[PDB]
């Protein structure tokens, strides 16, 4: 089964998931000088005031903070999107060292981590149907750099001890994801894919230009999680990122000049 190690990591995924070598795979390097400003792109509309977080889960590859997506409570619209996309979960990718961890790169620069807020297009009725469509998902990606602490991240950091190992979950109600956003919603956008198996080509990516800052102590706590289940030999959950994939026949558009 797939993972991030030498023997089951990103270079092996194509054997079980051939679409790994497809025409719209993610992540990609964002070459800032080649991205095209698109004046027709609208501002993002991030409406998270009624978000209902439920649970946090260590799934053996990352941790997911899950939301109630049975009603339009936390939605993303605008930008490149047509229609309404409901927030289902967010998760991160991070490194073993502060100089790596992000999936997207910016002029080949790697950030320490990357946050993915995953949303699905309500015209497809449920997430499982949405992932089978080329416009099924919208993922908002936010870079993390190490510097000052992010206060809105601390509640996530402090629960990680309770979900150390694969398959553990904990109640995670009343978390406000607005506390994870940077000031600016300027963004780049391109058509891509899930970045873990099954690697489905169903995502409109919206990557914010402005990173958030988190403290060294906050990211250190991410690195204490485990890929393994309880009672198995400890394997630290680090370097759970897929590297940049070929851009192929795609253009990255910028919302800003």
Ligand X SMILES: CCn1cc(-c2cc(C(=O)O)n(C)n2)c2ccccc21
131 binds, among Zn ion, ligand X, none (CB under 5 to 8 A by kind): ligand X
Q: Is the peptide bond before 72 cis (omega within 30 degrees of 0)?
A: no
Tell me how far, at minimum, the Cβ of 93 lies from Zn ion, in Å: 6
Nearer to Zn ion, 116 or 119 (CB): 116
Residues that bind Zn ion (CB under 5 A): 116
What pairs with residue 63 in β-bridges?
58
Tell me how far, at minimum, the Cβ of 87 lies from ligand X, in Å: 11
Encoded tokens for 123 = 């015209």
DSSP string across 126-162: SHHHHTTSTTSEEEEEEEEEESS--GGGHHHHHHGGG
DSSP one-letter code for 159: H
Nearer to ligand X, 38 or 68 (CB): 68
Near ligand X in 126-155, by CB under 6 A: 131
Is 195 labeled as ligand-binding? Answer: yes
Tell me how far, at minimum, the Cβ of 183 lies from ligand X, in Å: 25
- Would you call 33 a catalytic residue per the annotation? no
What pairs with residue 207 in β-bridges?
141, 188
Q: How far is CA 28 from the centre of its chain?
A: 13
- What positions carry a catalytic annotation? 61
Annotated binding-site residue numbers for Zn(2+): 91, 93, 116
Interaction site with ligand X (CB under 6 A): 116, 118, 131, 194-196, 198
């Amino acid at each position: 089964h797939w993972g991030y190690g030498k023997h089951n990591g990103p270079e092996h995924w194509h054997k079980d998931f051939p679409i790994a070598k497809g025409e719209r795979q993610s992540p990609v390097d964002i070459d800032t000088h080649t991205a095209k400003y698109d004046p027709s792109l609208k501002p993002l509309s991030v409406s998270y005031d009624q978000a209902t977080s439920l649970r946090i889960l260590n799934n053996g590859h990352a941790f997911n903070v899950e939301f109630d997506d049975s009603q339009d409570k936390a939605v993303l619209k605008g930008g490149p999107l047509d229609g309404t996309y409901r927030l289902i979960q967010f998760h991160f990718h991070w490194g073993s060292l502060d100089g790596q961890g992000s999936e997207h790169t910016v002029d080949k620069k790697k950030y320490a981590a990357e946050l993915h807020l995953v949303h699905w297009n309500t015209k497809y009725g449920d997430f499982g149907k949405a992932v089978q469509q080329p416009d099924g998902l919208a993922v908002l990606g936010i870079f993390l750099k190490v510097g000052s602490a992010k206060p809105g991240l601390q509640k996530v950091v402090d629960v990680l001890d309770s979900i150390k190992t694969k398959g553990k979950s904990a109640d995670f109600t009343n978390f406000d994801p607005r506390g994870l956003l940077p000031e600016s919603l300027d963004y780049w956008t391109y058509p891509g894919s899930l970045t873990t198996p099954p690697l489905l080509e169903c995502v409109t990516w919206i990557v914010l230009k402005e990173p958030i800052s988190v403290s060294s102590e906050q990211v250190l706590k991410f690195r204490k999680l485990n890929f393994n289940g309880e009672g198995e030999p400890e394997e630290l959950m680090v370097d759970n990122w897929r590297p940049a994939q070929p851009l192929k026949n795609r253009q990255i558009k910028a919302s800003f000049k």
